[PDB]
């Protein structure tokens, strides 16, 4: 019937045969999840003098 | 365990059937009287009983 098994759970699509499987199996959404700088309260209040 | 779930080869599965009811409500006669007499409202203490 010609389907579409789960090819990252290993089951080959059933078009596929032999050593071939599906190869874009994931969309990657190319945004990453980055941090932020954690705040500071000590550092501003300090006046520099010079050495 | 019965969440409707399909697969590729779609077919005659997750089948749902639907009721209906009915509620009802009757209909109740009542009533009451009283009797007088003319010698007790003719010659009667008071002139409104009635």
Redesign the interface.
């Given at each position: 019937?010609l389907?579409?098994?789960a090819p990252i759970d290993g089951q080959k699509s059933s078009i596929d045969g032999a050593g071939s499987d599906q190869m874009n199996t994931f969309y990657w959404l190319k945004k990453a999840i980055i941090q932020a700088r954690k705040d500071q309260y000590f550092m501003p209040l300090a006046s520099v003098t010079n050495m | 365990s019965k969440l409707p779930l399909l697969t590729?080869?779609g077919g005659r599965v997750n089948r749902v059937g639907f009721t209906r009811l009915s509620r009802e409500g009757s209909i109740h006669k009542f009533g009451f009287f009283y009797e007088f007499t003319q010698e007790s409202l003719d010659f009667d203490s008071d002139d409104q009983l009635k």
């Amino acid at each position: 019937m010609l389907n579409y098994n789960a090819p990252i759970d290993g089951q080959k699509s059933s078009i596929d045969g032999a050593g071939s499987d599906q190869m874009n199996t994931f969309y990657w959404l190319k945004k990453a999840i980055i941090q932020a700088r954690k705040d500071q309260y000590f550092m501003p209040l300090a006046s520099v003098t010079n050495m | 365990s019965k969440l409707p779930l399909l697969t590729e080869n779609g077919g005659r599965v997750n089948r749902v059937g639907f009721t209906r009811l009915s509620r009802e409500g009757s209909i109740h006669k009542f009533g009451f009287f009283y009797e007088f007499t003319q010698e007790s409202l003719d010659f009667d203490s008071d002139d409104q009983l009635k």
